[PDB]
Structure 1
């Protein structure tokens, strides 16, 4: 037997950081969940009980807190690059660090029309994430994403013209509900190291904002021929707006809302043009994925 691949570390490390402007009194909070997995010359911990090569996962947890104390935690693309670089520079036998960060929303409260200096609201479960892989000699690969963005439009979605055979019961339609939970990932070009990541810092927040805006506008305005077609249009625009992105991936469930035929009850009309009451379906659901890159 041989170890073909090994990685280990600390998952589900919850971190909060507060920034206090002494000038203005204004406080800003950041809350994340962090995962760090390491690889390197660690095979003997598995094969020979040799713990001397193990940086304890508890020590990894400590490091995350220390790094957050001494560095900015935003944008998470920078924080994660700093964190991963740390492990491969500090430990000679560690050659890769895999850092995943989930950012939780704490949005400043408006009270009486004015931004409150130190109160916040979790205004939805949408997340901003990063995956950062720091590999000794091979630079820094960053995948940024948004997830848990739940949307619905009540009309201007169509689905017709699909393949019909002896397994098909689905009726063509020119007017349906479309609802999904958006998972969108943009993959940056490889960066040579931390100096290069630092050089692009302003692009990370801006690109996140553009991706969200494009997603929302396109969903709302597209007279959609299918989930496939709509999602392609989203990906095409993001790539057009940020040249340092190599690929954009979307993964979208099609969360079905079914018509309910009530005609058995006193001839009540609740289908097609007369559909007002629908049954949301918890399962099953369509799942549609696409990765779009440059020609």
Structure 2
């Protein structure tokens, strides 16, 4: 009967930007995948098709490139500038979501202007503005890790659908996906990102795993305990199964040496590790 326009947002998604810093002969590369979406009073645009309040997505795109010309210290700093510009430059725009993926490059044999892509991980940043408030979530993804031993899984319930054998020695492989929310905008973004990455890797490798859940808990704990500016960290870790192949039919044995790496299905362990007292339902996690 009666229909109502609810939450909404629009903008330009995946604007691929490469910013080269070449004031000196020692070039620097900043490679980003930027997305910009605005929130505010767009009622008439939906109900009547009145574009008076619709800042064209093409315009949002042009702004990204225009702002990049001035350069930026970090990805987060760049998103902060974009968000401030759109929310303050238009009265009907009250907020939005600006996100970016940052791709890393390494110099080829330390060359001044020749690089190769480091595809082992992708850094992420998301800025959300709501009226007078803003929040930033940084993250990492695509970082595949594996422990060839020092992992076990036993003591789990055994119902009539359980066939999994308990083990005290198995491979533990996953793709590290983690996102953490800052409780302040005054952060050394690059330094914290590198720190967190190292803490996650260290926790994963040095923790004698009794369950992926425990390893993940330890990874999140290390971060919260080391960084006061981080209120919570969410992780989504797939258990990429490496099956110990049965070689007995061929007259052999397999002392935890030969594995079949299955694509699907895979276990998916996810959790939020937070600082006691901090909020547990922040809007930035809604996307």
Q: TM-score if structure 1 supplies the norm length? A: 0.90
Whether the aligned pair in 2 keeps the contact of 1:269 and 1:275 (CA below 8 Å) is no
Structure 1 stretches (4+) deviating beyond 3 angstroms? none
Residue 262 of structure 1: CA displacement?
A: 1.8
- Confirm whether residue 184 of structure 1 aligns to residue 178 of structure 2: yes
- Confirm whether residue 67 of structure 1 aligns to residue 67 of structure 2: yes
Q: Following superposition of structure 1 onto structure 2, how do residues 132-281 of structure 1 map, counting pairs within 5 Å?
A: 132-137=127-132, 139-189=133-183, 191=184, 197=185, 200-201=186-187, 203-265=188-250, 267-270=251-254, 274-281=255-262
Task: Give the structure 2 partner of residue 79 of structure 1.
Answer: 78
Residue 211 of structure 1: CA displacement?
A: 0.9
Whether the aligned pair in 2 keeps the contact of 1:85 and 1:97 (CA below 8 Å) is no
Whether the aligned pair in 1 keeps the contact of 2:100 and 2:126 (CA below 8 Å) is yes
Task: Give the structure 2 partner of residue 127 of structure 1.
Answer: 122
List gaps (5 residues or longer) in structure 2. 277-287
Q: SS in structure 1 opposite 2:136? A: strand
Whether the aligned pair in 1 keeps the contact of 2:125 and 2:136 (CA below 8 Å) is yes
Q: TM-score if structure 2 supplies the norm length? A: 0.92
Whether the aligned pair in 1 keeps the contact of 2:19 and 2:71 (CA below 8 Å) is no
Q: SS in structure 1 opposite 2:28? A: strand
Please give the alpha-carbon distance, in whole angstroms, between the structure 2 residues aligned to 1:276 and 1:171.
18
Equivalent residues, number: 274
Paired residue for 1:285, among 266, 270, 283?
266
Task: Give the structure 1 partner of residue 32 of structure 2.
Answer: 32
Paired residue for 2:112, among 114, 117, 121?
117
Residue 71 of structure 1: CA displacement?
A: 3.9
List gaps (5 residues or longer) in structure 1. 192-196
Residue 275 of structure 1: CA displacement?
A: 3.2
Residue 75 of structure 1: CA displacement?
A: 1.5
Task: Give the structure 1 partner of residue 91 of structure 2.
Answer: 92
Q: SS in structure 1 opposite 2:111? A: strand
Whether the aligned pair in 2 keeps the contact of 1:134 and 1:140 (CA below 8 Å) is yes
TM-align CA RMSD = 1.2
Residue 205 of structure 1: CA displacement?
A: 1.1
